[PDB]
Nucleic acid binder design. Structure first.
Ligand SMILES: [Ca+2]
Length: 579
DNA sequence: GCGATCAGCG
DNA sequence: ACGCTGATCGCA
């Protein structure tokens, strides 16, 4: 019902200087995954190509890599990375329908061409799930069915670029797509493909010691419980703590007793066992997520792990990282932080280099709120998290432990993002009256922040959405809900999304500027990871001293705010040492 | 499959 | 009853 040429070879008219291009990769994780078919729609017609012939045709390969041959796509990073695993470079991507739809409305959850097309009342294309099936029934359909599906996705991309660009422009988001999100997409593709090398010998050695410690702690739990049970069975763990041992019930879940860490540490005065349960869980998390789980995704021949950075997922414009998630490797407890010793440079005589923004969101907040006291504080390079800890624990700066500071950091963001006296009291284990008084005092010193919180909520009610500094957008229909609890969650999104999203806009622009600078200086240094406000590179040790001056300066100059940006940086032989 | 839990980011 | 995530596990 859609006409296309099922082509046995590549012809010249498939190689126009503008085209919609589909390079179909069905597996969720696209690293080293099969390319099942290719579709091209342009001024001369619609074409399906089998990958075994198109990708071995030198004229098609050259066309893929020629940046002056413009291609419109859906999820170009997926295609570019899968093409890299075939040793083929993809250049010239000038429109990405996934990123366009994510910018117009991140809450759509647009995950295939059909869902984006529906935004514009275009429905001549099927959802990928209807074509490939789900779960165990998932499969590549017969070639005629496959070819028509890829042609229809291309034809839709061809038709939808113009109406998506028009709405992007009306939102002031067209340059956010063309100059920020699409250039970043190519950079993430390089980072994912390069991967991160892993010391599997050290990881496996840590894993075997972990298992020994796990058994020990597990046994002392049974002998403290008087009996044996399944320390991961909530019904059984609840029965031990809150029936057998008769500990107080501080919190319930939808299903029964709560046993979260916060609860367990309030019960620590009552019984020895709760601290052992915490230690047991922590060691168990290292074992299953960070030892076993990481070894499961190491590519064995290279010892590299290849994450996927999802760039059209979070509602605030942050990236997220999957399989493995390399944005939540342990760091806060010393036993957990040791995991980062297994992350090593991919060449001999190279080093890991990490640079991170200092108090990024509070600096964004001071700029956006134009709070005089908060702006003066960062003009002075004060550490607000340390000063707040000094205040909270009545200590001197000399005596601020990394953990009191991590705790104070949660108070600082909690207050600006809407924590209640009740919630602050539970976090600090203080009186609820004290908690309210402290919050009131905090807004006395920063009345511009209080004003900003009120104004941004009112602006979300009037406009229906909030925006970031680079015009990322988030719709908030619930902000006018008649239900109090639904409205409240929405008001706290209005307070938080412009701040966290603007901080995401800044690190994204820093990544684009850093890549261009590394290329200008003809250095081998390249990005490996982003962790929200931190960038991790590797480079020859010969380049470290230049990177100590180049990387902070690029990051600090990515944007100009009413306060300076500050970057801390470290390097060393493993990711552990780059801190 | 989902909710509780915990690892990270602010 | 601060916000944004992803992986694992048991299943009241
Ligand atoms: Ca930081």
């Amino acid at each position: 019902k859609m006409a296309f040429t099922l082509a046995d070879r590549v012809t010249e008219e498939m190689l126009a200087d503008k085209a919609a291009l589909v390079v179909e990769v069905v597996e969720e994780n696209y690293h080293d995954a099969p390319i099942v078919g290719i579709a091209v729609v342009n001024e001369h017609g619609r074409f399906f190509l089998r990958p075994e012939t198109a990708l071995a045709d030198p004229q098609f390969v050259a066309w893929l890599g020629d940046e002056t041959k413009k291609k419109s796509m859906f999820d170009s990073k997926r295609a570019a990375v899968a093409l890299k695993w075939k040793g083929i470079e993809l250049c010239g991507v000038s429109f990405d329908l996934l990123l366009a739809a994510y910018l117009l409305d991140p809450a759509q959850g647009v995950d295939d061409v059909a869902a984006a097309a529906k935004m514009k009342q275009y429905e001549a294309v099927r959802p990928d799930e209807a074509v490939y099936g789900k779960g165990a029934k998932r499969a590549v359909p017969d070639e005629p069915v496959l070819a028509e599906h890829l042609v229809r996705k291309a034809a839709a991309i061809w038709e939808l670029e113009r109406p998506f660009l028009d709405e992007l422009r009306r939102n002031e988001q067209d340059r956010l797509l063309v100059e920020l999100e699409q250039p970043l997409s190519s950079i993430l593709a390089e980072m994912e493909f390069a991967g991160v090398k892993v010391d599997t010998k050290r990881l496996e050695q840590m894993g075997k010691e972990l298992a020994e410690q796990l058994g020990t702690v597990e046994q002392r739990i049974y002998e403290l419980a008087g009996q044996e049970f399944n320390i991961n069975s909530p019904k059984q763990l609840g029965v031990i703590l809150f029936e057998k041992l008769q500990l107080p019930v501080l919190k319930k879940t939808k299903t029964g007793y709560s046993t979260s860490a916060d609860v367990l540490e309030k019960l620590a005065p009552y019984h020895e066992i709760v601290e052992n349960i915490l230690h047991y869980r922590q060691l168990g998390k290292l074992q299953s997520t960070y030892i076993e789980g990481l070894l499961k995704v190491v590519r064995p021949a290279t010892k590299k792990v290849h994450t996927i950075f999802n760039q059209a997922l979070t509602q605030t414009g942050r990236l997220s990282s999957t399989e493995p998630n390399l944005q939540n490797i342990p760091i806060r407890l010393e036993e957990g932080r040791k995991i980062r010793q297994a992350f090593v440079p991919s060449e001999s005589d190279w080093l890991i280099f990490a640079a991170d923004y200092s108090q990024i969101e509070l600096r964004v907040l001071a700029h956006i709120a134009e709070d005089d006291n908060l702006m003066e504080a960062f003009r002075r390079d004060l550490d607000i998290h340390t000063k707040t800890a000094m205040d909270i624990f009545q200590v001197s700066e000399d005596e601020v432990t990394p953990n009191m500071r991590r705790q104070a950091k949660a108070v600082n963001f909690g207050i600006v993002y809407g924590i209640s006296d009740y919630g602050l009291a539970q976090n600090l284990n203080i009186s609820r009256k004290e908690a309210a008084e402290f919050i009131e005092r905090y807004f006395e010193s920063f009345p511009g922040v209080k004003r900003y919180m009120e104004n941004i909520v009112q602006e979300a009610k009037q406009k229906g959405y909030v925006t970031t500094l680079l015009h990322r957008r988030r719709y908030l229909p619930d902000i006018t809900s008649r239900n109090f609890n639904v409205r409240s969650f929405a008001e706290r999104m209005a307070m938080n999304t412009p701040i966290q999203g603007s901080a995401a806009d800044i690190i994204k622009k820093a990544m684009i500027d850093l890549n261009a600078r590394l290329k200008e200086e003809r250095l081998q240094a390249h990005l490996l990871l982003q962790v929200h406000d931190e960038l991790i590179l590797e480079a020859p040790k010969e380049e470290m001293e230049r990177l100590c001056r180049l990387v902070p300066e690029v990051m600090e100059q990515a944007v100009t705010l009413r306060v300076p940006l500050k970057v801390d940086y470290h390097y060393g032989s493993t990711w552990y040492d780059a801190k």
